[PDB]
């Protein structure tokens, strides 16, 4: 993304800027209990990567 | 088989002949020549599909007659319209014969 | 949307052209005239204004199109005339800002055939003023007077809102041209200038360029930093330690 | 480490292949004499394909060479590359440089130019195996490839509402026949790219602007008379 | 005078060794990183330099470099033996597709020995060792010795690289294609190579 | 060269004369007129090539057209004449 | 004295030409046609028939003119088809003698794209014989064959 | 060289560079007298070396 | 300034390498040919640029050497980039005999033209005929057949020395030949009047001559 | 140089009082004798003599 839209997008996505896109979010539900090694606040988003 | 043959058309040479005869008067009288007016008057005598070739040939004949002294003024010439459908020409008036 | 366009090309005091301006077409412009009329001269003017680097500029004849450097003459000197000469381009961006870019050319006196070149740029000019008018004085004589850069700077600074920038290095000139969208890539270094000139001159003479063909990957593929900088940072602690030990 | 590096390399390679494939389609069905199409053929070198696969899946067989802290990562890459294909020689150059070479994705790709000539299939474009006009047309094709690639590269450093100008030349254009010129005009028009062509009057393209030149001697000095025409069609 | 880039090229420290190898007939492949890069960089001038000797510097379409002498060559010429071209064409055949899975690029002397014995006709084998020979153990031992000898000659040409140990196991380089057949549109390499070997 | 060999040649033979020029289209009408008069004054034969018929009123001319035909290629040749 | 002249040029089994004969002019002969028609090929055939020295012949593109390239391929092989080929010239001597010079060309089987040349000359041929017919045999219903 | 230069047209670099060799013919009468002096001058070179 | 020959090479060396005589001479010198006074073109060229050629060939770890008699040749070092070879003992017998012929004033009347028969007669005159015969054939006892074999081997070696430049055949007669000064290298073991063994050791240390 | 070599001592010593011609100059051309700057090779060019 260009420098002109960069500040807009960074404000829009806020803390979730560095989340992960995952199109279902139910396939993670079994994996999730294992996450003991991760940032204290993990963000997940659904959509076509 | 035996070699065949094909022939050329002289329509453009004839066109050059009419234009050069029509234009010779300007030099003989040393009359100032303006491409805009001449092209506008001369294109009216032929149909649209042939205009481009007529314009080219007329310019080829006209430039041999003298020069335009205005070219050394540093002032560009304008784009004059010469027919409908939107054809344009750019040239200073020919003064020095 | 609305790609930019080159609008016109102006020559002043070149061989055969005291003051001439060509209005470029949006798609195709065709130069036509008998042998020796001066067509290649106009293209020489265009490219020299575009890339004012005397190390690269070499206008070899179309015959012998692919030979070595050969002579020490670059073929440019003879196209100028005694005194001061100019070559300028007029451009319209997607923003519809009118910018004029060009160079000033002069024959350096001596036994050898050498040339002196200085780039410049003007912004904010009114749409009512043409380059030929800026660069000439309509003195009483039959023929006007071409005015040097000093007179030009004084004349331009008098205008309201018009800015005249005069460059000391080619790098700055290319940087400004890129920022305004006149060229597709910002010529970081001399190597970039060389490749850009290769592109232009290969297009000019025509044919499958040997140099383009050799280094195809160098031309068609962008260089990616992501794969590298991680490992430069991770490698840093070892690099410093090794250097300290030495 | 290991797999993730392989994945980023693979994705970069895949994206480059796809972009090339998109550029490639714009050049289909271009008629230049007997040439009917042009392509940029992209392939992956074997000696690097096997290395990439090994780094992806056999990492437990070489982990000793990767986690040994006496040598850095790029050095590890160079040493692994020499372990495979042992016949390769090294020109007394530092392993660090060979490592950084392995880190650069472009080194994994092999590039060619091909043309679909006449009754034959796809052939590598050699100048000596083409007529004059075919060579000129192929050159123009590759040049527009380069220009498109460069514009895609730089747009991430340019304003969102800026579109650079594009212009190319052709000297002694009389060398091309009418059909080839029609093809070239179609290409440039579809690419929004300007052209300046020089010809000793032999060609009269109806579209665009034309300038007539005549050199004369006036007051014992050389002078060029210029006339212009445009708007036809 | 002399072209500047030519003087630069031959001033390089790598030139004397490469010159010595080239005049011996060695082929430079993509394996030799530095030499191959050097040739890629200075080809335009090295071709002219060697033309002064009536010898041609050719870059094969596969990528490897080599010299070809003319009839008026200023470098003394020498010529390979029949058995040499036989073995070369065999190696070209072994540069196959199943090779990758069969040997992972590393062969042994026995592979070549047995392939040669299996694929060639007996008459030309006798012509190679000696016409008086007939299917005897000593003849086969002599043929093995000759195979090792010619294989070492080819290693000097750069065709084949021995793995660095005393045992006779090696890998085949791309430059072996010089022995190969002519390729026509759609033709299968195995078939054409076999057709010439027959 | 012809003058040099005057001694060796038999008295009664004058050798043939012939030259080429590809991409003749690079020359304009005046230049070609000059070239023709030069070569005819010297009894010199010429063979020239151009995409378009640049010499309509002098010498002979042939027109070549290539046709793809049953998975091979064939060239068709037809002559041209100044007037019709 | 009457200077000698080149009467005609004949091509057999070239790339695009099966058997074609161009009749030259006393002063100027012009070849026209779109790109790739075969004009430069005709030039090349003529010069090959004039100087068969294979060490010299090198047909570069018109672009890249004047660049001493040492190209891998001299560009002649591709202009020939499989089988036997010819290129011949008919000349009228100052003595009004008809002489036919020429060469037999043939591709070499093998990876290297090499070519074979064998010159020849014919004297005293009757004026009624055309080279196109002399070099071919009429086999079948107007389906002639070339002969070695 | 002559024919090839004609074919591609233009000022051939090789022709002009050696124009003496191409235009000026050789003379045998000059050689016949120079044979004697050639012997003498070769002898002189021997002694000088 | 940049892009200037002097940056990479001395002007005189580049001037030498650009000369038309260089390729022939380089090819011959690497082949082992000795250069004497008679072939003026090559000898004068060597004299003109001697130091440049010595510095050039030094890159290969070989010395371009000039004998006091005025003839040049190449002597490779132990780390030579160019292979090195040694002559056969029969070659030595004929070489020393050719030297003794060159010195001999009694045969100066021949004006330099010698015949293979005369050379053979001198050789048999000085060496031990029958014991030298041992090398031609292990069973030789003076038989004329074996004598002819010795003569033919001598003829062959003489031809090989012709290739080394040690002797020139006449333009039309291959049975007669003329000597050159290069033959004096066969005398290197005796040109100084001192203990032979120390001479031998100095030669082997200098790389002139190997044992067998 | 042809005048220098052609005209000999005994008769032309009265002519030699001109500043341009002398005998020693023939040996002075020994410098030019060693190597002229010839470029392209065919047949056999060698030296001033
Ligand atoms: N460096 C130079 N020195 C001297 N005269 C020159 C130089 N460059 C060009 N000229 C002359 O300027 C005139 C115009 O040359 P130019 O190359 O522009 O012609 P042109 O119209 O492009 O011709 P053509 O299309 O036939 O090549 C010619 O007389 C040419 O001789
Ligand atoms: N060596 C070759 N190998 C394969 N095809 C070739 C070879 N040489 C020429 N051709 C093809 O033969 C056809 C004739 O080419 P040629 O150059 O003779 O045509 P032309 O009419 O002279 O064209 P132009 O005027 O554009 O030069 C073209 O398709 C060219 O691609
Ligand atoms: Mg031009
Ligand atoms: Mg052609």
Residue numbers in the entry:
A (entry chain B): 693 to 741
B (entry chain C): 344 to 440
C (entry chain A): 2 to 247
D (entry chain A): 1236 to 1468
E (entry chain F): 9 to 206
F (entry chain B): 1385 to 1468
G (entry chain B): 2 to 149
H (entry chain B): 199 to 247
Paper text:
MukBEF folds the chromosome of Escherichia coli and related bacteria. The heads are bridged by the kleisin MukF, whereby the C-terminal winged-helix domain (cWHD) of MukF binds the ‘‘cap’’ surface of one MukB, and the N-terminal middle domain (MD) binds the coiled-coil ‘‘neck’’ of the other MukB. MukF also recruits the dimeric KITE protein MukE.
All three conditions enabled the reconstruction of a state with engaged heads, and we pooled the datasets to increase the signal and obtain higher resolution (STAR Methods). ATP binding and head engagement had triggered the detachment of the MukF MD from the MukB neck, which resulted in a swing-out of the MD of about 180°. Detachment of the MD was facilitated by the mechanical distortion of the MukB neck constrained between engaged heads and aligned arms, while the MD swing-out was stabilized by the binding of MukE to the top surface of the heads. This surface is formed by the engagement of the heads upon ATP binding and is a highly conserved DNA-binding site in all SMC complexes. While gate opening is a prerequisite for loading, it is likely detrimental to loop extrusion and needs to be suppressed during the operation of the motor. Our findings suggest how this is achieved, and how the switch from ‘‘loading mode’’ to ‘‘loop extrusion mode’’ may be implemented: once DNA is inserted into the clamp during extrusion, the top surface of the heads becomes inaccessible to MukE, blocking the gate opening mechanism described above.
